[PDB]
Design an enzyme around this catalytic site. Structure first.
Site, PDB file in Angstrom:
ATOM      1  N   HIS A   1       0.766  -1.136   0.041  1.00 45.97           N
ATOM      2  CA  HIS A   1       0.104   0.077  -0.010  1.00 45.97           C
ATOM      3  C   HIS A   1       0.970   1.369  -0.012  1.00 45.97           C
ATOM      4  O   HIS A   1       0.043   2.317   0.038  1.00 45.97           O
ATOM      5  CB  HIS A   1      -0.806   0.007   1.212  1.00 45.97           C
ATOM      6  CG  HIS A   1      -1.876  -0.967   1.107  1.00 45.97           C
ATOM      7  ND1 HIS A   1      -3.185  -1.111   0.457  1.00 45.97           N
ATOM      8  CD2 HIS A   1      -2.043  -2.121   1.900  1.00 45.97           C
ATOM      9  CE1 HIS A   1      -3.798  -1.996   0.427  1.00 45.97           C
ATOM     10  NE2 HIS A   1      -3.254  -2.711   1.338  1.00 45.97           N
TER      11      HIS A   1
ATOM     12  N   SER B   1      -0.874  -1.957  -6.364  1.00 46.88           N
ATOM     13  CA  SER B   1      -0.492  -3.208  -6.878  1.00 46.88           C
ATOM     14  C   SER B   1      -0.387  -2.979  -8.341  1.00 46.88           C
ATOM     15  O   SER B   1      -0.379  -2.076  -9.094  1.00 46.88           O
ATOM     16  CB  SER B   1      -1.900  -4.054  -6.834  1.00 46.88           C
ATOM     17  OG  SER B   1      -2.888  -3.525  -7.508  1.00 46.88           O
TER      18      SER B   1
ATOM     19  N   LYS C   1     -15.982  -8.835  -6.112  1.00 46.50           N
ATOM     20  CA  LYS C   1     -15.062  -9.619  -6.878  1.00 46.50           C
ATOM     21  C   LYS C   1     -14.608 -10.515  -6.119  1.00 46.50           C
ATOM     22  O   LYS C   1     -14.467 -11.836  -6.479  1.00 46.50           O
ATOM     23  CB  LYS C   1     -14.219  -8.804  -7.773  1.00 46.50           C
ATOM     24  CG  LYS C   1     -13.252  -9.738  -8.620  1.00 46.50           C
ATOM     25  CD  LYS C   1     -12.414  -8.847  -9.683  1.00 46.50           C
ATOM     26  CE  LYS C   1     -11.611  -9.706 -10.299  1.00 46.50           C
ATOM     27  NZ  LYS C   1     -10.821  -8.865 -11.321  1.00 46.50           N
ATOM     28  N   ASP C   2     -14.069 -10.207  -4.783  1.00 47.64           N
ATOM     29  CA  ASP C   2     -13.508 -11.136  -3.999  1.00 47.64           C
ATOM     30  C   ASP C   2     -14.533 -11.925  -3.167  1.00 47.64           C
ATOM     31  O   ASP C   2     -14.335 -13.164  -2.763  1.00 47.64           O
ATOM     32  CB  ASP C   2     -12.766 -10.213  -2.625  1.00 47.64           C
ATOM     33  CG  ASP C   2     -11.365  -9.741  -3.124  1.00 47.64           C
ATOM     34  OD1 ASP C   2     -10.955 -10.039  -4.413  1.00 47.64           O
ATOM     35  OD2 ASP C   2     -10.967  -8.650  -2.672  1.00 47.64           O
TER      36      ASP C   2
ATOM     37  N   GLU D   1       3.219 -34.916   1.688  1.00 42.92           N
ATOM     38  CA  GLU D   1       2.322 -34.563   0.906  1.00 42.92           C
ATOM     39  C   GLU D   1       2.522 -33.989  -0.367  1.00 42.92           C
ATOM     40  O   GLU D   1       3.424 -33.537  -0.600  1.00 42.92           O
ATOM     41  CB  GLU D   1       1.143 -33.621   1.590  1.00 42.92           C
ATOM     42  CG  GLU D   1       0.682 -34.590   2.916  1.00 42.92           C
ATOM     43  CD  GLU D   1      -0.327 -35.922   2.494  1.00 42.92           C
ATOM     44  OE1 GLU D   1      -0.787 -35.619   1.670  1.00 42.92           O
ATOM     45  OE2 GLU D   1      -0.180 -37.030   2.957  1.00 42.92           O
TER      46      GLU D   1
HETATM   47  C1  HEM Z   1       0.146 -16.083   4.301  1.00 44.27           C
HETATM   48  C2  HEM Z   1       0.763 -15.822   3.278  1.00 44.27           C
HETATM   49  C3  HEM Z   1       0.181 -14.595   2.240  1.00 44.27           C
HETATM   50  C4  HEM Z   1      -0.524 -13.531   2.571  1.00 44.27           C
HETATM   51  C5  HEM Z   1      -1.637 -13.575   3.778  1.00 44.27           C
HETATM   52  C6  HEM Z   1      -0.510 -12.810   1.278  1.00 44.27           C
HETATM   53  C7  HEM Z   1      -1.400 -11.567   1.102  1.00 44.27           C
HETATM   54  C8  HEM Z   1      -1.111 -10.750  -0.068  1.00 44.27           C
HETATM   55  C9  HEM Z   1      -2.488 -10.079  -0.559  1.00 44.27           C
HETATM   56  C10 HEM Z   1      -3.806  -9.928   0.125  1.00 44.27           C
HETATM   57  C11 HEM Z   1      -2.088  -9.446  -1.562  1.00 44.27           C
HETATM   58  C12 HEM Z   1      -2.573  -8.242  -2.259  1.00 44.27           C
HETATM   59  C13 HEM Z   1      -3.085  -9.198  -3.710  1.00 44.27           C
HETATM   60  C14 HEM Z   1      -2.254  -9.264  -4.467  1.00 44.27           C
HETATM   61  O1  HEM Z   1      -1.546  -8.522  -4.934  1.00 44.27           O
HETATM   62  O2  HEM Z   1      -2.363 -10.542  -5.247  1.00 44.27           O
HETATM   63  C15 HEM Z   1      -0.494  -9.806  -1.805  1.00 44.27           C
HETATM   64  C16 HEM Z   1       0.434  -9.170  -2.898  1.00 44.27           C
HETATM   65  C17 HEM Z   1       1.689  -9.922  -2.931  1.00 44.27           C
HETATM   66  N1  HEM Z   1       1.877 -11.006  -2.552  1.00 44.27           N
HETATM   67 FE1  HEM Z   1       1.290 -12.015  -0.819  1.00 44.27          FE
HETATM   68  N2  HEM Z   1       0.268 -13.070   0.389  1.00 44.27           N
HETATM   69  C18 HEM Z   1       1.173 -14.207   1.005  1.00 44.27           C
HETATM   70  C19 HEM Z   1       1.817 -15.064   0.322  1.00 44.27           C
HETATM   71  C20 HEM Z   1       2.913 -14.535  -0.641  1.00 44.27           C
HETATM   72  C21 HEM Z   1       3.787 -15.252  -1.049  1.00 44.27           C
HETATM   73  C22 HEM Z   1       4.135 -16.625  -0.497  1.00 44.27           C
HETATM   74  C23 HEM Z   1       4.445 -14.292  -1.969  1.00 44.27           C
HETATM   75  C24 HEM Z   1       5.898 -14.667  -2.694  1.00 44.27           C
HETATM   76  C25 HEM Z   1       6.505 -15.769  -2.753  1.00 44.27           C
HETATM   77  C26 HEM Z   1       3.695 -13.363  -2.058  1.00 44.27           C
HETATM   78  C27 HEM Z   1       4.056 -12.192  -2.877  1.00 44.27           C
HETATM   79  C28 HEM Z   1       3.363 -11.098  -3.128  1.00 44.27           C
HETATM   80  C29 HEM Z   1       3.521  -9.971  -4.013  1.00 44.27           C
HETATM   81  C30 HEM Z   1       4.832  -9.809  -4.839  1.00 44.27           C
HETATM   82  C31 HEM Z   1       2.333  -9.119  -3.878  1.00 44.27           C
HETATM   83  C32 HEM Z   1       2.285  -7.887  -4.592  1.00 44.27           C
HETATM   84  C33 HEM Z   1       2.113  -8.192  -6.136  1.00 44.27           C
HETATM   85  C34 HEM Z   1       1.411  -7.214  -6.893  1.00 44.27           C
HETATM   86  O3  HEM Z   1       0.672  -6.167  -6.178  1.00 44.27           O
HETATM   87  O4  HEM Z   1       1.662  -7.015  -8.127  1.00 44.27           O
HETATM   88  N3  HEM Z   1       2.706 -13.494  -1.215  1.00 44.27           N
HETATM   89  N4  HEM Z   1      -0.254 -10.695  -0.832  1.00 44.27           N
HETATM   90  C1  LIG Z   2      -6.699  -5.022  -5.518  1.00 41.94           C
HETATM   91  O1  LIG Z   2      -6.054  -6.213  -4.912  1.00 41.94           O
HETATM   92  C2  LIG Z   2      -5.970  -6.294  -3.393  1.00 41.94           C
HETATM   93  C3  LIG Z   2      -5.154  -5.185  -2.794  1.00 41.94           C
HETATM   94  C4  LIG Z   2      -4.957  -4.975  -1.666  1.00 41.94           C
HETATM   95  C5  LIG Z   2      -5.740  -5.922  -0.715  1.00 41.94           C
HETATM   96  C6  LIG Z   2      -5.620  -5.790   0.875  1.00 41.94           C
HETATM   97  O2  LIG Z   2      -4.823  -4.812   1.451  1.00 41.94           O
HETATM   98  C7  LIG Z   2      -6.308  -6.815   1.568  1.00 41.94           C
HETATM   99  C8  LIG Z   2      -6.200  -6.575   2.962  1.00 41.94           C
HETATM  100  C9  LIG Z   2      -7.219  -7.762   0.941  1.00 41.94           C
HETATM  101  C10 LIG Z   2      -7.751  -8.921   1.597  1.00 41.94           C
HETATM  102  C11 LIG Z   2      -7.168  -9.817   2.553  1.00 41.94           C
HETATM  103  N1  LIG Z   2      -7.720 -10.667   3.333  1.00 41.94           N
HETATM  104  C12 LIG Z   2      -9.001 -10.676   3.181  1.00 41.94           C
HETATM  105  C13 LIG Z   2      -9.812 -10.033   2.216  1.00 41.94           C
HETATM  106  C14 LIG Z   2     -11.157 -10.436   2.154  1.00 41.94           C
HETATM  107  C15 LIG Z   2     -12.035  -9.783   1.162  1.00 41.94           C
HETATM  108  C16 LIG Z   2     -13.376 -10.061   1.208  1.00 41.94           C
HETATM  109  C17 LIG Z   2     -13.939 -10.785   2.502  1.00 41.94           C
HETATM  110  O3  LIG Z   2     -15.398 -11.156   2.465  1.00 41.94           O
HETATM  111  C18 LIG Z   2     -15.771 -12.401   2.019  1.00 41.94           C
HETATM  112  F1  LIG Z   2     -16.489 -12.502   1.046  1.00 41.94           F
HETATM  113  F2  LIG Z   2     -16.182 -13.030   3.009  1.00 41.94           F
HETATM  114  F3  LIG Z   2     -14.735 -13.196   1.647  1.00 41.94           F
HETATM  115  C19 LIG Z   2     -13.293 -11.323   3.285  1.00 41.94           C
HETATM  116  C20 LIG Z   2     -11.829 -11.184   3.313  1.00 41.94           C
HETATM  117  C21 LIG Z   2      -9.082  -8.960   1.551  1.00 41.94           C
HETATM  118  N2  LIG Z   2      -7.360  -7.868  -0.399  1.00 41.94           N
HETATM  119  C22 LIG Z   2      -6.591  -7.012  -1.041  1.00 41.94           C
HETATM  120  C23 LIG Z   2      -6.630  -6.998  -2.436  1.00 41.94           C
END
Ligand code: HEM
Ligand SMILES: COc1ccc2c(O)c(C)c(-c3cncc(-c4ccc(OC(F)(F)F)cc4)c3)nc2c1
Ligand code: HEC
Ligand code: HEC
Ligand code: HEM
Ligand code: HEM
Ligand code: HEM
Ligand SMILES: COc1ccc2c(O)c(C)c(-c3cncc(-c4ccc(OC(F)(F)F)cc4)c3)nc2c1
Lengths: 370, 237, 72, 146, 57, 370, 72, 54
Positions: free
Chosen positions: F192, F196, F218-219, F262
């Protein structure tokens, strides 16, 4: 760019005059982090089953390399964790910090979240006072109409405290501290919008100071002294605050003579034993805690601190005596001298908070032509 | 009830340890008197090593008693001489046999008895050493005896000890008091084997904390010294 | 919040020394001690009496508790 | 300066002392308790047969002319028989494969689905032969492993 | 000059050198403190510990 | 005034074109929160001792009211939790989001922190493949010189996997997810600051959009479909990704025929079984993961995405095949056809990442006169 | 960051309708379908062949694996 | 300890007291438990019917 958040630890504006009483906020941050590490290493050797739990503590205290110190840094690491609160709260009431409503109402929610966690934590060794403690205290919800017979059996996972009651406490216990850690960072967040209070109750924007060399080393000192009074108990009187009947395993068919919770609940318990009516006793118990949320709506003095409120000082330190009384009565049995005392003190607790202390500041305003 | 008296035990000191020589005598008491009627589930013959018995001496005692161990390849269970890993043999197989063999009464375990009774070892010595006939007006049922140091002053514990009830190895006179002293010393080791190692850390602490507290208190009043010594003035136009 | 614009102050002066150039324990016994006694008498009459009252009800309740359990 | 900086320096010494201990206490907690160490060492025991027995929660395994007749050089891991046993009629071996940790089946030697009767390897993926613990014979019937 | 001034010029001036003192101090401190501490405890509890009597057995 | 922080969920600038591939970041936020609730309710009835653990799962799956669904929403709630990653990562590599170094290096630290947690979590049922899985895989550290014989016995708390090995996994397992939850909020925090990425790799400051009506719903959609593919397995094929030998309790004296972790580890395992040298096999295993931290230092194309990099597309989807191969080889036994294949694929994995894919963008630059 | 000053844009126009005033599925089959096939052919030759190659080494490795275990 | 008629809470009675007696009574071989045998063998119930009937 996390470390803009570390400005709350380094370049934070803070007043200059604040004495030791404020350190007790930080120390919880140490006890909590301390206690989590210890209780974790107890999880490595604890078993949540009834046929194996009490022995599991023995495995720690006997066969493990320095397993025993961890038990006592952790049990008594809860006792000191409540000396810190009750003084951390008394500050907030005496120096009038409760005007930070957003924090205070969360200060309550930390307290409850904790003071149930110790209850669960005291069960896990699975001795008499553990079991019988939980047996008595859960039944109080049975007093509620139309629910209690259903809710209590649900919490127990059965019809009396047994295996599944234990195993779930271990899970409700080994989780909430990670929830408590969140609410603390929340609790601070609303504080770092306002900045802390001082003994005077006056806006200290003029004489602020940084936090990195000054209160840090002050917290290092205050933390050090805390580790003393903890380890003294661990190294010179570990069974002091305990209760030796706990070192007999649980026997649901053999009631101990003296049932009571540990020292840090007892003032609550004395309030309960005071009232004969069961349900009416309960709503007094929960109200002895929740009354903190009624304080700011009972603020009456146009001042904040109590360094400059003589009558409230005398009433405040009277409240402390009423508490100390209730701590004592709860630990002692129920007989005609102690019954009478336990009734009077409990009435003072609610009376003094709701009536006199508000009434005082009203009077104090009048003398100052307000 | 009767508050027991506090005594000058050798280990009452904040840095005083246990008479390991006395722990040796105390075990001989439990073994020849109480091990027939009391369990101690939470101790091993190995824990005695380096405290009151050595390796070989304890090992010899492991080979005195037989222990039920080992599903045979035939599909049965047998008896063998105990080893050091083995715990103290329980005299009875289950508490009901105990209540059966003691008129419904239950000999308690003694792993934690010190730390499971108010007054601690002071209680126990006064308990054994407190037997007497009941006073006038008092009468008890058969099996149960009088002792002022118990709630209700009625227990099934018949006299376990007296003068020359046993013999010691070190040539000690086995007076009832000498016996009850040593055994209570043993039990305090059972319920708190960390005792002798507790205080050593208690010693290391106070010496360090005797140093760090003033030194930290200097750095505090070194850094705060700017503010305890600053001054102010007010120069309006 | 941060330093710089917390409030407004004018015509105020501060003097201070370097901690390496002043004692950390100046008049620690010579002047500190009577300040404590001064800090003590200023407040002690407001802290003492409920705890003084406690010690009495502690004993009187304790003795009366004992006497209740004894006999006719 | 040296006076003031000495205060913090000496302090730092006392911290690191304690910080060394409590960590060493904790890490020692996670290591083996006293209970495991007893059973790890004390292992008492009592033809043409091999039995799988437990030791340290691992398997422990317990003709002569034939095994001696097997050549040493032809083994992938050249070892003589008596170099692996202290008496020829007692093969004390450890059911762990040197290829990857797996157990061979007993009995004409061994086979692993993941050797000879002496414990040496002949054919298969096994890189090394069966290992021999540190043991001793206290009597003509009793045996102590480790 | 005094000793304190000599110590600062060589050790407490450079933070690199400074830290190495502290580790070096800890080692000799860890050794010296444990020896002295045990001696006191044993002297108090003389003839009560295992090794003080172990020779007999 | 928390809800200024909810602007990261409501009024957040986000691009307009991003397709489903980005939802997998949020879904982890659901799986994680989902999995914590389930595994918690398993703690209420689980026992960490060896004589009682395997049965404890039976208590859940048999006697408890709907205890059984929770086991399978939770086990397979880990499988889906890694389909989400491997696609959540492949996005980050294919669309070139790894230029957000601060996040990516933390993306790694989340991965490891997880992919050890499942290892610990797979032990807790205490069956054969649980035990023998942990028996083999811990011994790999024994390959390290001068340490391994000491470190492995330390982790075990003994000289082989036994009680105290189990009980500590249960505590290392039921804690780290609360640490993982922290690093996620950290991981987002550095995101943030930058906002993204999009399929194009181009700065999208011009065509941003809010987040509250658009990606939320969408989510909600993408989350709904996830709950399908989870519950299908729970309600139509729960033993699918499992391994039936797990449903025999642990027998340390009876090795199963096929030892393997696994499905979600297997590509790592195949790399290990490829190399005969034990220690050299290990450093390949850890490097198959840590190589992600070498990607950005091997970026060569002056573009970011791979929608506009034809040669890298062909190499990328080749890498996926090499993975899928390694997933397959690891599950299959070790014989002369599969040995040969497992060697070639593993070489491709390191070769393709380090050499060809950088080499491609260099070539692609040359065609564009760069 | 926030809206308002993210970048600078000039002489650009956007038109949009209210969702209550337009269909949510316009030409969903009529126009969407060939876009998919267009979206498919645009990329499929780059996704297919390694997975096509996989299916072969899967079978050939599988059969050769079988034959290895049979006999002389 | 005595013997009584079983009740519903009681589990299926184990034929043998311990696995060694089983190995003793079946030439070293171990009759396995059958609570999870379906889900502890590849092929499942198809295997078992073919096993008995094979
Ligand atoms: C518990 C594990 C993780 C959580 C809770 C998490 C959560 C998130 C969320 C919500 C986003 C925003 C959505 C998105 O940009 O796709 C994000 C972005 C991203 N994640 Fe994670 N993610 C996890 C694991 C990982 C792992 C394992 C990697 C790399 C090996 C990773 C790399 C990235 C990158 C590079 C972004 C930003 C990419 C972009 O915005 O273009 N994440 N993460
Ligand atoms: C544009 O891409 C992005 C960019 C930033 C993001 C971000 O800062 C966060 C915190 C998250 C996110 C992380 N965990 C859970 C949710 C969530 C969404 C809907 C739900 O509602 C239900 F329908 F119940 F799943 C429950 C949880 C969202 N998503 C991002 C996606
Ligand atoms: C003759 C069998 C017997 C022997 C010998 C014996 N005990 Fe007792 N003991 C009992 C029984 C039976 C009880 C149960 C008392 C009761 O139920 O009130 C008891 C009670 C006790 C108690 C009091 C428990 C309590 O809560 O007050 C202690 C302490 C104790 N045993 C320890 C000892 C000690 C110390 C000795 C002598 C070194 C000893 N036992 C020898 C049978 C014995
Ligand atoms: C005569 C005693 C006996 C009876 C009757 C018997 N079993 Fe068996 N069973 C055994 C023994 C002994 C084994 C061990 C096989 C081995 O060790 O290879 C075995 C093996 C099995 C196996 C195969 C285990 C495996 O891993 O392959 C199954 C399945 C089984 N039993 C179930 C059954 C079924 C189904 C029946 C008929 C409904 C049955 N038992 C009746 C003694 C018996
Ligand atoms: C945060 C508030 C907590 C409070 C008020 C609290 C209090 C207690 C108390 C008083 C006991 C009794 C121990 C004894 O009598 O020996 C206990 C037991 C226990 N606690 Fe804590 N605790 C807290 C947090 C934790 C944490 C964070 C952990 C682990 C990370 C933990 C793990 C345990 C375990 C396993 C036991 C049982 C083992 C034993 O009692 O010996 N507790 N808790
Ligand atoms: C886990 C429990 C707690 C933690 C981690 C915690 C932490 C802190 C810390 C570090 C501070 C700053 C230091 C200070 O102002 O004293 C603080 C302030 C404060 N706390 Fe808590 N505290 C806890 C419990 C409580 C409780 C139980 C209450 C009230 C019942 C409370 C009420 C307050 C108030 C009012 C302040 C601000 C007062 C002021 O700044 O003048 N806290 N807390
Ligand atoms: C966050 C990453 C996690 C991963 C990758 C993971 C993975 C797994 C897996 C694959 C199993 C095997 C279950 C089975 O085979 O039946 C398992 C077991 C278990 N998990 Fe999770 N888990 C995670 C988090 C959690 C959490 C947050 C909890 C509790 C709040 C939890 C509690 C448990 C328990 C108690 C078991 C053993 C009970 C059982 O398996 O039946 N786990 N874990
Ligand atoms: C001016 O009053 C305040 C105002 C605001 C505060 C605040 O926002 C925080 C986060 C904290 C705090 C909370 N937990 C722990 C510590 C801590 C301090 C020293 C340590 O160092 C060691 F010696 F190890 F204890 C270790 C931890 C500090 N104290 C505040 C005190």
């Amino acid at each position: 760019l996390m470390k803009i958040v570390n400005n709350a630890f380094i370049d934070l504006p803070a007043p200059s005059n604040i004495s030791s009483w404020w350190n007790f906020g930080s120390l919880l941050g140490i006890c909590l982090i301390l206690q989590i590490l210890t209780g974790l290493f107890l999880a490595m050797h604890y078993t949540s089953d009834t046929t194996t739990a009490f022995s599991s503590v023995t495995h720690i205290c006997r066969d493990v390399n320095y397993g025993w110190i961890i038990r006592y840094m952790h049990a008594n690491g809860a006792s000191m964790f409540f000396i810190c609160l009750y003084m951390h709260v008394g500050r907030g009431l005496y120096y009038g910090s409760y005007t930070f409503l957003e924090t205070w109402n969360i200060g309550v929610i930390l307290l409850l979240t904790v003071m149930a966690t110790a209850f669960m934590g005291y069960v896990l060794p699975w001795g008499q006072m553990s079991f019988w403690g939980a047996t008595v205290i859960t039944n109080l919800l049975s007093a509620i109409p139309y629910i209690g017979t259903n809710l209590v059996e649900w919490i127990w996972g059965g019809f009396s405290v047994d295996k599944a009651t234990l195993t779930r406490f271990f899970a409700f216990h080994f989780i909430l501290p990670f929830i408590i850690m969140a609410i603390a960072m929340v609790h601070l967040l609303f504080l770092h919008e306002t900045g802390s209070n001082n003994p005077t109750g006056i806006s200290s924007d003029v004489d602020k100071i940084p936090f990195h060399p000054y209160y840090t080393i002050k917290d290092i000192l205050g933390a050090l002294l805390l580790i003393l009074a903890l380890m003294l108990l661990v190294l010179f009187a570990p069974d002091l605050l305990g209760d030796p009947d706990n070192y007999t395993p649980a026997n649901p068919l053999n009631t101990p003579p003296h049932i009571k919770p540990e020292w840090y609940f007892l003032f609550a318990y004395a309030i309960l034993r005071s009232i004969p009516n069961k349900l009416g006793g309960v709503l007094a118990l929960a109200f002895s805690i929740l009354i903190l949320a009624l304080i700011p709506l009972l603020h009456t003095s146009k001042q904040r601190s109590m360094m400059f409120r003589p009558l409230s000082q005398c009433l405040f330190w009277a409240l402390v005596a009423d508490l100390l009384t209730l701590t004592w009565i709860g630990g002692q049995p129920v007989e005609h001298p102690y019954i009478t005392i336990g009734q009077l003190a409990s009435v003072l607790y609610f009376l003094l908070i709701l009536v006199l202390m508000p009434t005082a500041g009203t009077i104090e305003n009048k003398l100052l032509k307000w | 009830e009767l508050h027991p008296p506090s005594y000058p035990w050798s280990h009452r000191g904040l840095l005083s340890s246990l008479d390991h020589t006395s722990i040796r005598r105390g075990f001989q008491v439990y073994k020849q008197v109480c091990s027939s009627c009391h369990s101690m589930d939470y101790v091993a013959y190995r824990h005695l090593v380096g405290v009151c018995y050595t390796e070989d001496e304890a090992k010899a005692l492991a080979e005195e008693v037989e222990v039920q161990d080992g599903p045979n390849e035939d599909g049965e269970m047998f008896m063998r001489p105990g080893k050091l890993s083995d715990y103290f043999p329980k005299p009875y197989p289950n508490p009901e046999a105990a209540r059966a063999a003691n008129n419904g009464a239950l000999p308690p375990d003694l792993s934690y008895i010190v730390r499971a009774r108010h007054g601690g070892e002071d209680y126990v010595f006064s308990l054994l050493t407190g037997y007497c006939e009941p006073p006038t007006g008092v009468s008890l049922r058969e099996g149960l005896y009088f002792n002022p140091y118990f709630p209700g002053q009625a227990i099934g514990m018949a006299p376990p000890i007296y003068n020359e009830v046993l013999e010691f190895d070190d040539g000690t006179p086995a007076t009832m008091s000498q016996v009850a002293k040593d055994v209570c010393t043993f039990l305090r080791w059972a319920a708190e084997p960390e005792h002798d190692h507790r205080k050593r850390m208690g010693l290391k602490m106070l010496l360090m904390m005797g140093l760090l507290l003033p030194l930290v208190y200097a750095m505090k009043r070194h850094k705060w010294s700017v503010l305890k010594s600053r001054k102010l003035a007010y120069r309006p136009p | 919040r941060q330093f710089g614009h917390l409030t407004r102050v004018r015509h105020v002066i501060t003097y201070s020394l370097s901690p390496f150039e002043q004692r950390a324990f100046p008049h620690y016994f010579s002047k500190g001690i009577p300040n404590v006694l001064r800090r003590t008498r200023a407040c002690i009459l407001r802290v003492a009496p409920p705890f003084v009252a406690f010690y009495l009800v502690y004993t009187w309740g304790t003795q009366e508790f004992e006497k209740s359990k004894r006999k006719n | 300066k040296g006076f003031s900086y000495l205060v913090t320096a000496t302090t730092t010494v006392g911290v690191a002392y304690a910080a060394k201990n409590v960590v060493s206490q904790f890490v020692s907690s996670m290591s083996a308790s006293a209970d495991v160490l007893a059973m790890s060492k004390i292992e008492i025991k009592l033809e043409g047969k091999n039995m799988a027995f437990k030791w340290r929660g691992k398997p422990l395994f317990v003709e002569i002319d034939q095994e001696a007749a097997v050549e040493v050089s032809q083994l992938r891991d050249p070892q003589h028989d008596l170099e692996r046993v202290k008496k020829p009629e007692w093969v004390i071996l450890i059911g762990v494969c040197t290829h990857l940790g797996c157990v061979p089946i007993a009995n004409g030697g061994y086979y692993c689905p993941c050797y000879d009767a002496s414990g040496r390897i002949r054919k298969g993926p096994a890189p090394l032969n069966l290992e021999v613990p540190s043991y001793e014979f206290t009597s003509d019937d009793m045996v102590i492993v480790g | 000059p005094t000793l304190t001034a000599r110590l600062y010029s060589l050790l407490f001036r450079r933070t690199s050198t400074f830290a190495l003192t502290i580790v070096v101090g800890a080692l000799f401190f860890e050794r010296a403190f444990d020896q002295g501490a045990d001696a006191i405890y044993e002297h108090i509890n003389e003839g009560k510990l295992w090794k003080h009597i172990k020779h007999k057995y």
